[PDB]
Amino acid sequence: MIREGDKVVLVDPRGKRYLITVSKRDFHTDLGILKLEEIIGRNFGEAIKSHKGHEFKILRPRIVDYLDKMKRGPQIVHPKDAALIVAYAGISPGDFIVEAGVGSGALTLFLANIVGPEGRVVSYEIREDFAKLAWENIKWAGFDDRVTIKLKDIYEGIEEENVDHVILDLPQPERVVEHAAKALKPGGFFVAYTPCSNQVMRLHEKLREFKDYFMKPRTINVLVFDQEVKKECMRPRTTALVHTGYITFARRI
Amino acid sequence: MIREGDKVVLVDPRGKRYLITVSKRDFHTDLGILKLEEIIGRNFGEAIKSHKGHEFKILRPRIVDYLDKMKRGPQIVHPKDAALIVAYAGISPGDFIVEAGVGSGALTLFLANIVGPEGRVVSYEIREDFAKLAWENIKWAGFDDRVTIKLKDIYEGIEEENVDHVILDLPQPERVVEHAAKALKPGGFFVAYTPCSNQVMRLHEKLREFKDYFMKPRTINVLVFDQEVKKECMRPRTTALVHTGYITFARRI
Amino acid sequence: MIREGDKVVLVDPRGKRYLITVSKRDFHTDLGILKLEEIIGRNFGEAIKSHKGHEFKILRPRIVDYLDKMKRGPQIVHPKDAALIVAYAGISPGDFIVEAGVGSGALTLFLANIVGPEGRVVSYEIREDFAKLAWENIKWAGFDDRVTIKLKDIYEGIEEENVDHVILDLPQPERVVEHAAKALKPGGFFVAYTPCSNQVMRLHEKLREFKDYFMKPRTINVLVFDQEVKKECMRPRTTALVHTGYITFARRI
Amino acid sequence: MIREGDKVVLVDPRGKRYLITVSKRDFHTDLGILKLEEIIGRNFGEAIKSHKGHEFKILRPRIVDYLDKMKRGPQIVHPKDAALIVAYAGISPGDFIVEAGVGSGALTLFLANIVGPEGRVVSYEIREDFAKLAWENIKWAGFDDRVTIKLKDIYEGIEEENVDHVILDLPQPERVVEHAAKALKPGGFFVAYTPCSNQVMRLHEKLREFKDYFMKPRTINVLVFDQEVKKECMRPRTTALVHTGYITFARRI
Ligand SMILES: Nc1ncnc2c1ncn2[C@@H]1O[C@H](CSCC[C@H](N)C(=O)O)[C@@H](O)[C@H]1O
Ligand SMILES: Nc1ncnc2c1ncn2[C@@H]1O[C@H](CSCC[C@H](N)C(=O)O)[C@@H](O)[C@H]1O
């Protein structure tokens, strides 16, 4: 039951993915021209061929596909870091999240998927060009129902009340700690992602000032090694992404 | 609206958590005796005092509290590893998951929380004492509605059809690859956690045999460093958990 | 040609080492009493037996044995860190090194071994109990000929001239930068080991002030993983020493 | 007393090094032409200028400069790995080392520097073009006195006797274990560098066969992180070299 306007992932013989809207149009590939209207009426698992006879397999888009093919700026939160945010703050279906700044919306997409259609994410942003980019990513991924972008400076305050988590990727998360203490419910998490150890120190100094409002904070950083596994040789990949940012957690009350 | 039989987390002045069922009983602490009936009628955020005048703050249990206080055996999947499984396989609210072996239920609790009340997890297990331990953990955490434990050897087959993910923490995941190829929907993930590099090699040799059923597999391992952040000194903690297991992902067709 | 008063390493059937001075005495072990005079006249490679028949093999002490069996306080420079100091600063036979503070002498032993009998290490120290501990370790290891300990505060100056390397494990290495610029020959290294990232920042600010005296500084930290290699399972050891200190290098002129 | 035919390091205003032989020639640079005869008669620490007025400072070449500027092939042992070899096997001035294969001579240069003018390194090699490349590097660095290259296959045997260390960067170090057991003195080290975990497993199986000849083997791998230290931000460098090879040590008797 694939209809016109539906999104679909096409998979190459090389295993390359193309995330595509189904329409009566020509799609130009590396490996020939695809007649997209052929997809209509077909099912996931089936395939289409280019004019050169190369086969493209049809998959339902998953969160991994939207995240991988998203339009982005240079600074995003990596899936490995979003993964640890979700895990250590216990982010759950139905949660209400305040986040800032929205950026390209990578973290936002990840979180919106996790809280599900009855959860909510409100993301503050001060750059209208990034707000627009993120909004387009979020509509494209199908999460406009649960995510709202505000063009507003979160250092001036958080309008929301009884929130589950306040999640920051901002230059100065210490300017949000007081607002978060008021906005968060008992047991909710304050979480901040910060590239520099200078940021971590300034954040911790603020959290110490607010020690009657939070449990003991914890700061981590995560590294993921890829393994090269061939018939005659397993070893880690030679180079890795070794640093993106520190992640600090503080539980309210 | 805290009623009798409700679960509650009590937080120490030291920040220690006690995950408790509310009844009219006496609770014995490090810091004196608590009269749990006093919790009844109270609200989250409020507090109770021990007979020695020590204050215990009252929180709603979150997934982090269940995971942290769970009854466990010596071999569990760590939250950092569960986090990366969820992230790289795109595990989402409503998903249908086959898992084995259930173990103590740690990975199962984590996944059950992510898939939500309309998702499902079916966990196979061959040791009835672990099946019982996991079942008691899952009922305690409130997930009996969405998780089912089967006392059955998954090497003999997977009954389920059109599953989103098959997720393994088993000595021999290569003996499940064919069953998973049949059970998984197009685009679903096979994921296996394995402590030893020998397991990774055997698994990859099997996935190569089934290269027509899966995209190119990926194997990772994740390390999380804790930071020590004091007024005058920030540095990583001296010692870390540096290895638990490798994680392999292969996407179906 | 093993004589009385020689030092010798005795190796257990379990592979445990005992670094011992050969005299006509009784040595009490886990595995029985050893008659040490029986070593006299023997050669390296041969063995002695305890009164319970357990065999102790006789080796010549190497630097690894002195380092491993040295009397120490709680804060030393680890061999892995000393290794990188030697490597990245190009520490060589015949070099003249100024070091501070001596501590237990661990770094000093390592460096003294590398510069050889014609190199020299001068180590400054302000605590006389540590100066004595280090001196006893250095005499025991046979390096009194090339190492001198000074009971003097290196923040007040370095007397030495045309030195190859100034090597610091001190709370405030920035108070030594100016003295080191004067003491070092052209192309010599300033090197500083520091546990905290706050120390690294203060040091780098000082080195920026002295940017006309040094090349661009480099700061590293080193992690060594142990592998567990059994017949049926290879994997990294579960836990590791993941942080000791950062190491900063700056080459003079 | 810089005379003609001497080697010198020239340092750029940008901090770039040029390792050069002093002759009456013209040296063409990025920053103008250098009249190299001007160096004659001068001292280390002084400078030459290009015709364009840019200053090049004069340093004595150190092992770090030879290692950094060496002509190499694609596969060398990294200084961090050579560092741990030296450290954990206790490689010392005066040692006699057998090494294979010589490669580009990077490990050989490192080791030759450590053993000093009275130590010896004998390196076996089976490819004549690499033997020649290494020989040219070793003569250039000034170590022809202490290093000998043999065009010979070390799997056929080690001619040398009472050696301190046998040091391997070979596809199959297990084919050398028996020869090393015979060649090594009591307490000498067998050391092997291997990129793949499969090599580590085959090597350990051979060392278990020879367990009456060696103490318990140890396998490590080393990672060095670079830190970025700017006035307003300290953080690890984003990317790192995360794997080169494992290093296995076994002490003879
Ligand atoms: N005070 C503030 N309030 C709201 N947004 C802010 C802010 N200060 C900075 N920002 C925004 O925060 C963003 C940091 S980049 C955030 C990237 C995002 N986490 C992603 O994964 O795609 C920038 O877009 C910046 O404009
Ligand atoms: N073939 C098989 N089918 C089902 N369970 C199996 C199995 N082989 C081993 N097991 C079970 O797999 C488990 C591995 S320990 C699993 C721990 C779990 N992931 C947690 O986080 O708590 C054991 O309980 C073992 O009994």
Ligand SMILES: Nc1ncnc2c1ncn2[C@@H]1O[C@H](CSCC[C@H](N)C(=O)O)[C@@H](O)[C@H]1O
């Ligand atoms: N200004 C100063 N001058 C000389 N020594 C100093 C000093 N400030 C601190 N110290 C000494 O520096 C030492 C730091 S611990 C050094 C450990 C040593 N690197 C080892 O490996 O064993 C202490 O012994 C302290 O007493």
Ligand SMILES: Nc1ncnc2c1ncn2[C@@H]1O[C@H](CSCC[C@H](N)C(=O)O)[C@@H](O)[C@H]1O
């Ligand atoms: N059996 C054998 N005997 C001697 N050399 C061998 C050998 N098998 C392989 N080799 C050589 O071993 C080398 C591996 S590359 C060694 C690189 C070297 N450690 C460096 O740092 O520069 C190659 O030059 C190869 O020709």
